[PDB]
Ligand binder design. Structure first.
Ligand code: CL
Ligand code: CL
Ligand code: MN
Ligand code: MN
Length: 174
């Protein structure tokens, strides 16, 4: 039985560097990985990115962010993209095709500023929400925690004070 993993995922921070630093500082070295799914509006050479896996958003104009990132975490293959290059506002068919060709455990995306967690195929798709500019029905700034083991993905959405926001948590069996 694999040892349990915990990942921290955020996105669409939009020029708020204190929140990125705060989340880095809180979690780097205490969880298995920390992810940012883009639209930070920060420089890729920022020291705030030490310990964090970050991809390019459409509102990231500086050279040096990757469009896609594959992170293999033990037996867990995580893929990560902003989403704009997959036309996710149209639908998720292009994103899901890529996730299937990669045979990902987890597919991380941003762009929509809407928190979501669903299982399609055996693949968890997660948008952590926007940590600065929430959209849709939930007007609270959010990021996400995923707990991973052989039996379950557990997803909680967390506020900027690092508390679980109720009514959004999901548990998926694998
Ligand atoms: Cl799009
Ligand atoms: Cl946008
Ligand atoms: Mn954005
Ligand atoms: Mn975007």
């Amino acid at each position: 039985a694999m040892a349990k993993q915990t990942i921290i995922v955020m996105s669409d921070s939009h020029g708020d560097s204190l929140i990125v630093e705060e989340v880095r500082d809180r979690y780097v070295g205490k969880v298995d990985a920390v992810f940012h799914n883009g639209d930070s509006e920060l420089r890729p050479d920022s020291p705030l990115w030490e310990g964090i896996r970050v991809v390019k958003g459409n509102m990231d104009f500086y050279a040096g962010y990757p469009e896609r990132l594959v992170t293999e975490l033990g037996s867990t293959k995580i893929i990560q993209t902003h989403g704009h290059l997959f036309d996710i506002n149209f639908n998720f068919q292009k994103l899901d095709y890529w996730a299937q060709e990669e045979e990902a455990a987890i597919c991380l995306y941003g762009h929509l500023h809407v928190p979501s967690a669903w299982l399609e195929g055996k693949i968890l798709f997660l948008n952590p929400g926007s940590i600065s500019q929430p959209r849709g029905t939930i007007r609270e700034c959010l990021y996400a925690r995923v707990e991973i083991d052989d039996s379950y993905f557990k997803v909680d959405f967390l506020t900027r004070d690092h508390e679980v926001y109720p009514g959004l948590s999901k548990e998926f069996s694998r």
